[PDB]
């Protein structure tokens, strides 16, 4: 019969819909790549090349930068979230880190699937670290920051390498904290949060 008129917050108990999209492109083992023609850090990143022609659609779509993109495998029923560049292809071309292929478990001249994904970035992200000397650098903190800016998307069952000074780093994302059902992480600028926990209980002997 009456109204009060007043409406308070009702914001908490809103759900934002992520960002869902669908391309089909076939990709290539860029470590067959000749090294002149292709760069050490994209082997090792986690960048993609795709056609523009994806790209335009996404626009009509109102998709905002960065975009993200997520890999699908129908061989392994496996899907990972991986980064893009930049659209160099004309005619359709997907390139992947030799890394990457493995996880995917898809091999040279397999079809791969790659669908624009949005979410809300993450709050908590739980890295794995792996050798007691990644935790002796004086600013870790700060190559982390590196490897986020590396990979558009995060996902917490994708495990992501980085490269420094020609060493390798593996980091496996155990556990974040979503607010999708997604359960994927993705980190733009500087939203999520990394903690390092050692999860290994082996000591190794100081060498002098």
């Not at 029923?77 to 390139?95: K, N, P, Q, S």
Request: glycine share 8%; net charge negative.
């Amino acid at each position: 019969m009456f109204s009060g008129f007043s409406s308070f917050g009702g914001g908490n108990g809103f759900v934002n819909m992520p960002q869902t999209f669908e391309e089909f492109f076939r990709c290539y083992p860029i470590a067959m790549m000749n090294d002149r023609i292709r760069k050490d850090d994209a082997n090792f990143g986690g960048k993609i090349f795709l056609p523009p022609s994806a790209l335009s659609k996404l626009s009509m779509l109102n998709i905002r930068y960065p975009m993200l993109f997520k890999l699908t495998a129908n061989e392994t029923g496996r899907v990972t979230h991986g980064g893009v560049l930049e659209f160099i292809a004309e005619e359709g071309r997907v390139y992947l880190p030799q890394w990457m292929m493995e996880t995917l478990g898809i091999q040279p001249g397999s079809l791969l699937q790659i669908s624009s994904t949005d979410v809300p970035l993450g709050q908590f992200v739980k890295l794995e670290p792996q050798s007691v000397d990644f935790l002796d650098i004086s600013d870790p903190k700060a190559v982390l920051e590196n490897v986020l800016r590396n990979f558009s998307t995060l996902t917490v069952d994708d495990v992501i390498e980085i490269s420094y000074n020609g060493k390798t780093f593996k980091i496996k994302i155990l556990e974040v904290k979503p607010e999708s059902s997604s359960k994927s992480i993705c980190v733009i600028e500087t939203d999520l949060v990394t903690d390092f926990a050692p999860p290994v209980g082996y000591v190794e002997p100081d060498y002098k």
